[PDB]
């Protein structure tokens, strides 16, 4: 059952990046919410999507 040919595999690291909207939260009250630029758009819509 051990068979070695080759496996598709990632060659680059991922990217997490603080938004211009998100960086102020790190400055104002020292936190980062992931996709805080995207949670806000649900708030001016149906909230919990």
């Amino acid at each position: 059952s051990i068979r070695r040919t080759g496996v598709k595999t990632p060659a680059s690291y991922g990217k997490f990046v603080l938004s211009k909207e998100n960086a102020v939260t790190a400055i104002a009250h020292h936190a980062i919410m992931a996709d805080f630029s995207q949670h806000a758009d649900r708030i001016q819509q149906s909230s919990q999507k």
């Binding site: 790190a26 020292h30 936190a31 980062i32 919410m33 992931a34 996709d35 708030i43 001016q44 819509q45 149906s46 909230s47 919990q48």
Partner: protein, 145 residues
């Protein structure tokens, strides 16, 4: 510094119905809407007997008429769901909508739509439960049978 909160992933829970499970072959599932008025569903079975008689001196046991009757056993199911009065208020309370309330109103719509839908799962899963427990409470152990 951050706190770095990442994505609050929801547990989307799998939905089952009574007939979709495999127990449905053990049930003959019938809707009857005036059922609460009933007392004891009582299927009558008329059984003709097989007959054999023979010989000289052998006591011929006479022909037999058998009428057995089995009854129904009730077991109703009941789940509560608990919507807060504050969560019911935001359909009516409905403040300055921007920045504050459009979160809390539309989430209270979701919260009520969450629990009512989750309760429909419970009515099905409880129907999985008690129909199983009826099949437990009428099945003898195998060494008896």
């Amino acid at each position: 510094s951050f706190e770095a909160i990442f994505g609050t992933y929801c547990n989307k829970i799998e939905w089952v119905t009574f007939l979709g499970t495999a127990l449905a072959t053990a049930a003959h599932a019938i809707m009857f809407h005036d059922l609460n008025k009933m007392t004891t569903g009582k299927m009558l079975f008329y059984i003709q007997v097989p007959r054999v008689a023979t010989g000289a001196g052998i006591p011929t046991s006479r022909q037999t008429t058998v009428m057995v009757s089995k009854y129904s056993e009730k077991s109703p199911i009941t789940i509560p769901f608990e919507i807060s009065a504050a969560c019911l208020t935001h359909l009516k309370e409905t403040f300055e909508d921007t920045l504050l309330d459009k979160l809390l109103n539309a989430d209270a719509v979701n919260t009520v739509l969450r629990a009512v839908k989750n309760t429909a799962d419970a009515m099905e899963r409880g129907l999985i439960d008690t129909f199983l427990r009826v099949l437990l409470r009428h099945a003898p152990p195998c060494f008896v049978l």
